């Protein structure tokens, strides 16, 4: 079932560099896995910002939680979660 | 191109089930075309979170303005860009 | 699974009549049922306010959505829904 | 009596050594006790955030305040306190 | 114990009659009794505003909330409740 | 004349030493003097938070400024000042 | 002593009819009076708004208050009041 | 198509030195190119602020996104993006 | 000189009549004049909204104010006015 | 023509030693100049804040921008600029 998840990314202004390589790499794989499995249904970029707007499809809140906590970006993320329900006036799937 | 659109519904107190109907055809046309790409309900609220997939701001503007609920809608629009981590599509 | 739900009541101005007492009652009985059956798990009044703050225990967002929409007070409410998850350091129920 | 308390954790990032291990365990132990003793009544994870929504059951504002001030995590917490009241529609115990 | 309470008044605009006069005078008498007995400890005007900042001294939240609910102006009030605690640097009485 | 002052404390993220204990006592010492003299009329603690909510009884905006300015904690405070006025429905003094 | 006072005017949407002239008339008369005597020290219009930004020069919060309350426009005004102190870096008068 | 974009600038206060002057030059040459091509249609300074308010004319969100991202200043920017539509009443070209 | 002026339109819900008729027409008439005379330099519609984001080019605040104060829609408008300055990075025209 | 300017000061928590005393003195002298020349028309301290509410009287947005830009405190200031217009009910100066 569906959640609207806004993420905003706050990489430490100075430092890491360039462990920034290891972290950005686990993040892109981790997000590819999650998208391949349908967990991470949709992924877009907020135009002009370092952050995404996503729709997750998971079985429960606890699942959504562990998935987000697992993200390599987590300690650097600001996350808003928002439960999505079916709309009567919908037509196809989703 | 994609827009994340939010529509909060307030209807006037002294005011109908034709509108829900009217809007539902408009919604269906648009969805059959694919420019009202996704329609969701915000759990607990009257109204949708929608993605729209149109060619111009002017297309989206007139399309949003065609909705019969429009005089009663609170609308926020956010542009959506392709993410480099994306796999599925869009 | 768990949602924290805030409900702020805004009952109509120069309207209602004897029907208000009927709406209050409709609402009070829908809520009793919902608590007996367990889906309206916890219910508290916000000190100094007309509304409630609640914990719901339902199977999906869709069930929650249908429950809130069924509430007679629904057209006069502002509603905030937040997903709750099992906390690693819990020692009791929930 | 009853309080709704939201807490958000902003721990120092690249700062902590195995001191980090000392505070987290220190916090789990204090929270376990407060839950065993009854004053930390409910404790939930805010889905996708380093945080909790909690309900504390204590006998004064000062007892709440002393309990919160005493949490190992306190210096890095953002805390919101909300008094809760009995809702006439409540079935069973608040 | 102590609460800081903010109240904002929004009476029906041109909608009342001999009713407004009764409503005002019943509120005035309610607040007087409450101050005379001491649960309504301090009461101030927010300068330039149709509002008050108050300190209530009551023994529970439920008691505060029944006090505020019983106010004739209650339906037309905007109310903020803040629990207050003892400051370790206080000279004399809270 | 009366002012509602909230002060939120945000000490250096250590960035502090045994100057810190020297500081907290300077503040304690100054707050003590001002309550004794009477311009710091009421002092309370925001439940769950590091700071205070207070009523100051001074003769001018200017004198309140100099008092707030002179607080040891000053450069670490976020302050709100709100003028309180005499409420017509006031029975006792304040 | 000095106050920055913002006033936002909001006259009944439809309504008012013929008295809208008398209200504005008395309003103009009252502000004229307060400026002459010097408690209404400065009066400026926020460009593009129906509403003013002013400085008042009065002896107390109560007197500020009695003045704002007596404006014909009061019931329709949203008001922010901010105490103003002499700036040590001032050269001239105020 | 048109977007109204707000950028606020936040350069790390230290330490930079000469490489700040190089940063500012690249930004300024990149902004010139963008304006000569037409993508950066209007640029104005927010009076009193290290910032700009701008109108972009690009073919798509993704084109807007890529231009904002390529800015030398981007890592120090706060950006608000607003899509702009044609107003029926317009007389000019835009 | 330049101002960024936002306008949000809020017509009364149970009103107008032939009143909506005259109003819009004279609104168009007035914006024609202001655009062709150049004081209303740019006029856009915010995508998905009723009202407009504009740039005014006038010679004083008093001029801007009499202009907006004169719009037929003024009693129904919410207006944000913000000064625009010349950005040193500009190439062609302000 | 006139502007209402809010300024709030956030000096580096510490990078200053008595270099800070230089900067305060420099800010003071620059402020002395602008006030003498009559551009900084009014200057008040916001009670309890390190800040000011000022009125600026300058021929253009560009003149005001350059002025605020030139203040020694600028990279530490947060500034609100608001245009001020002639008020019809005004009597004496401004």
CSV table of N, CA and C in Angstrom, one decimal, chain C residues 2 4 6 28 31-32 35-36 40-47 51-53 55 82-94, chain D residues 2 4 6 28 31-32 35-36 40-48 51-53 55 82-91 93-94:
chain,number,residue,atom,x,y,z
C,2,UNK,N,-0.8,1.1,12.9
C,2,UNK,CA,-1.1,2.2,13.8
C,2,UNK,C,-1.0,3.6,13.1
C,4,UNK,N,-1.5,7.8,14.1
C,4,UNK,CA,-1.9,8.9,15.0
C,4,UNK,C,-2.8,9.9,14.2
C,6,UNK,N,-5.3,13.3,14.4
C,6,UNK,CA,-5.8,14.5,15.1
C,6,UNK,C,-7.0,15.0,14.4
C,28,UNK,N,-21.3,9.9,18.3
C,28,UNK,CA,-21.0,9.2,19.6
C,28,UNK,C,-21.2,7.7,19.5
C,31,UNK,N,-18.6,6.1,17.1
C,31,UNK,CA,-17.3,6.0,17.8
C,31,UNK,C,-17.2,4.9,18.8
C,32,UNK,N,-18.4,4.6,19.4
C,32,UNK,CA,-18.5,3.5,20.4
C,32,UNK,C,-18.2,2.1,19.8
C,35,UNK,N,-14.6,1.8,18.8
C,35,UNK,CA,-13.7,1.4,20.0
C,35,UNK,C,-13.9,0.0,20.5
C,36,UNK,N,-15.2,-0.4,20.6
C,36,UNK,CA,-15.5,-1.8,20.9
C,36,UNK,C,-14.9,-2.8,19.9
C,40,UNK,N,-10.7,1.9,16.5
C,40,UNK,CA,-10.5,3.2,17.3
C,40,UNK,C,-9.9,2.8,18.6
C,41,UNK,N,-8.6,2.6,18.6
C,41,UNK,CA,-7.9,2.1,19.7
C,41,UNK,C,-7.8,3.0,20.9
C,42,UNK,N,-7.3,4.2,20.7
C,42,UNK,CA,-7.2,5.1,21.8
C,42,UNK,C,-7.8,6.4,21.4
C,43,UNK,N,-8.4,7.1,22.3
C,43,UNK,CA,-9.2,8.4,22.0
C,43,UNK,C,-9.0,9.3,23.2
C,44,UNK,N,-8.5,10.5,22.9
C,44,UNK,CA,-8.3,11.5,23.9
C,44,UNK,C,-8.8,12.9,23.4
C,45,UNK,N,-9.3,13.7,24.4
C,45,UNK,CA,-9.6,15.1,24.1
C,45,UNK,C,-8.3,16.0,24.3
C,46,UNK,N,-8.1,16.8,23.3
C,46,UNK,CA,-7.1,17.9,23.5
C,46,UNK,C,-7.6,18.9,24.5
C,47,UNK,N,-6.8,19.1,25.6
C,47,UNK,CA,-7.1,20.0,26.7
C,47,UNK,C,-7.4,21.4,26.2
C,51,UNK,N,-12.2,18.6,19.9
C,51,UNK,CA,-11.8,17.7,18.8
C,51,UNK,C,-11.5,16.4,19.5
C,52,UNK,N,-10.4,15.8,19.0
C,52,UNK,CA,-9.7,14.7,19.6
C,52,UNK,C,-8.4,14.4,19.0
C,53,UNK,N,-7.5,13.8,19.8
C,53,UNK,CA,-6.4,13.1,19.3
C,53,UNK,C,-6.5,11.6,19.5
C,55,UNK,N,-5.6,7.2,18.3
C,55,UNK,CA,-4.8,6.1,17.7
C,55,UNK,C,-5.7,5.1,17.0
C,82,UNK,N,-1.0,10.5,10.8
C,82,UNK,CA,0.4,10.2,10.8
C,82,UNK,C,0.6,8.7,11.0
C,83,UNK,N,1.5,8.1,10.2
C,83,UNK,CA,1.9,6.7,10.4
C,83,UNK,C,2.7,6.5,11.6
C,84,UNK,N,2.3,5.5,12.4
C,84,UNK,CA,3.1,5.1,13.6
C,84,UNK,C,3.7,3.7,13.4
C,85,UNK,N,5.0,3.5,13.8
C,85,UNK,CA,5.7,2.2,13.7
C,85,UNK,C,6.1,1.7,15.1
C,86,UNK,N,6.3,0.3,15.1
C,86,UNK,CA,6.9,-0.3,16.2
C,86,UNK,C,8.3,0.3,16.6
C,87,UNK,N,8.4,0.7,17.8
C,87,UNK,CA,9.7,1.3,18.3
C,87,UNK,C,10.6,0.2,19.0
C,88,UNK,N,11.8,0.1,18.5
C,88,UNK,CA,12.8,-0.8,19.0
C,88,UNK,C,12.9,-0.9,20.6
C,89,UNK,N,12.8,0.3,21.2
C,89,UNK,CA,12.9,0.3,22.7
C,89,UNK,C,11.6,0.1,23.4
C,90,UNK,N,10.5,-0.3,22.8
C,90,UNK,CA,9.2,-0.6,23.4
C,90,UNK,C,9.3,-1.7,24.5
C,91,UNK,N,8.7,-1.6,25.6
C,91,UNK,CA,8.6,-2.7,26.6
C,91,UNK,C,7.2,-3.2,26.9
C,92,UNK,N,6.1,-2.5,26.5
C,92,UNK,CA,4.7,-2.9,26.7
C,92,UNK,C,4.0,-3.4,25.5
C,93,UNK,N,2.6,-3.1,25.5
C,93,UNK,CA,1.8,-3.4,24.3
C,93,UNK,C,2.0,-2.3,23.2
C,94,UNK,N,1.5,-2.6,22.0
C,94,UNK,CA,1.6,-1.8,20.8
C,94,UNK,C,2.9,-2.1,20.0
D,2,UNK,N,-2.2,12.6,31.6
D,2,UNK,CA,-1.7,12.1,30.3
D,2,UNK,C,-1.2,13.2,29.4
D,4,UNK,N,0.8,13.9,25.5
D,4,UNK,CA,1.3,13.6,24.3
D,4,UNK,C,2.6,14.3,24.1
D,6,UNK,N,6.1,14.5,21.6
D,6,UNK,CA,6.8,14.2,20.4
D,6,UNK,C,8.3,14.6,20.7
D,28,UNK,N,18.3,3.6,26.1
D,28,UNK,CA,17.4,2.4,26.1
D,28,UNK,C,17.1,1.9,27.6
D,31,UNK,N,14.7,4.5,29.4
D,31,UNK,CA,13.4,4.4,28.8
D,31,UNK,C,12.7,3.1,29.1
D,32,UNK,N,13.4,2.0,29.2
D,32,UNK,CA,12.9,0.7,29.6
D,32,UNK,C,12.3,0.7,31.0
D,35,UNK,N,9.2,2.9,31.3
D,35,UNK,CA,8.1,2.0,30.8
D,35,UNK,C,7.7,0.9,31.8
D,36,UNK,N,8.7,0.4,32.5
D,36,UNK,CA,8.4,-0.7,33.4
D,36,UNK,C,7.7,-0.1,34.6
D,40,UNK,N,6.3,6.1,31.4
D,40,UNK,CA,6.4,6.2,29.9
D,40,UNK,C,5.3,5.2,29.4
D,41,UNK,N,4.1,5.6,29.1
D,41,UNK,CA,3.0,4.6,29.0
D,41,UNK,C,2.9,4.0,27.6
D,42,UNK,N,3.0,4.8,26.6
D,42,UNK,CA,3.1,4.3,25.2
D,42,UNK,C,4.3,5.0,24.5
D,43,UNK,N,4.9,4.2,23.6
D,43,UNK,CA,6.1,4.7,22.9
D,43,UNK,C,6.1,4.1,21.5
D,44,UNK,N,6.0,5.0,20.5
D,44,UNK,CA,5.9,4.6,19.1
D,44,UNK,C,7.0,5.3,18.3
D,45,UNK,N,7.4,4.6,17.2
D,45,UNK,CA,8.3,5.2,16.3
D,45,UNK,C,7.6,6.0,15.2
D,46,UNK,N,8.0,7.2,15.0
D,46,UNK,CA,7.5,8.1,13.9
D,46,UNK,C,8.1,7.5,12.7
D,47,UNK,N,7.3,7.0,11.8
D,47,UNK,CA,7.7,6.3,10.6
D,47,UNK,C,8.6,7.0,9.7
D,48,UNK,N,9.8,6.5,9.6
D,48,UNK,CA,10.8,7.1,8.7
D,48,UNK,C,11.6,8.3,9.3
D,51,UNK,N,13.0,9.4,15.9
D,51,UNK,CA,12.0,10.1,16.7
D,51,UNK,C,10.9,9.1,17.2
D,52,UNK,N,10.1,9.6,18.1
D,52,UNK,CA,9.0,8.9,18.7
D,52,UNK,C,7.9,9.9,19.0
D,53,UNK,N,6.7,9.3,19.0
D,53,UNK,CA,5.5,9.9,19.6
D,53,UNK,C,5.3,9.0,20.8
D,55,UNK,N,3.3,8.7,24.9
D,55,UNK,CA,2.3,9.2,25.9
D,55,UNK,C,2.8,8.9,27.2
D,82,UNK,N,2.0,18.1,24.9
D,82,UNK,CA,0.6,18.4,24.8
D,82,UNK,C,-0.2,17.7,25.9
D,83,UNK,N,-0.8,18.5,26.7
D,83,UNK,CA,-1.7,17.8,27.7
D,83,UNK,C,-2.9,17.1,27.1
D,84,UNK,N,-3.3,16.0,27.6
D,84,UNK,CA,-4.4,15.2,27.1
D,84,UNK,C,-5.5,15.1,28.1
D,85,UNK,N,-6.8,15.2,27.6
D,85,UNK,CA,-7.9,15.0,28.5
D,85,UNK,C,-8.8,13.9,28.1
D,86,UNK,N,-9.7,13.5,29.0
D,86,UNK,CA,-10.7,12.5,28.9
D,86,UNK,C,-11.7,13.0,27.9
D,87,UNK,N,-12.1,12.1,27.0
D,87,UNK,CA,-13.0,12.4,25.9
D,87,UNK,C,-14.3,11.7,26.3
D,88,UNK,N,-15.4,12.5,26.4
D,88,UNK,CA,-16.6,11.9,26.9
D,88,UNK,C,-17.1,10.7,26.1
D,89,UNK,N,-16.6,10.6,24.9
D,89,UNK,CA,-17.0,9.5,24.0
D,89,UNK,C,-16.2,8.2,24.3
D,90,UNK,N,-15.2,8.3,25.1
D,90,UNK,CA,-14.2,7.2,25.3
D,90,UNK,C,-14.9,6.0,25.9
D,91,UNK,N,-14.7,4.8,25.2
D,91,UNK,CA,-15.1,3.6,25.8
D,91,UNK,C,-13.9,2.9,26.5
D,93,UNK,N,-10.8,2.7,29.4
D,93,UNK,CA,-9.8,3.5,30.1
D,93,UNK,C,-9.2,4.5,29.1
D,94,UNK,N,-9.0,5.7,29.5
D,94,UNK,CA,-8.3,6.7,28.7
D,94,UNK,C,-7.0,6.1,28.3
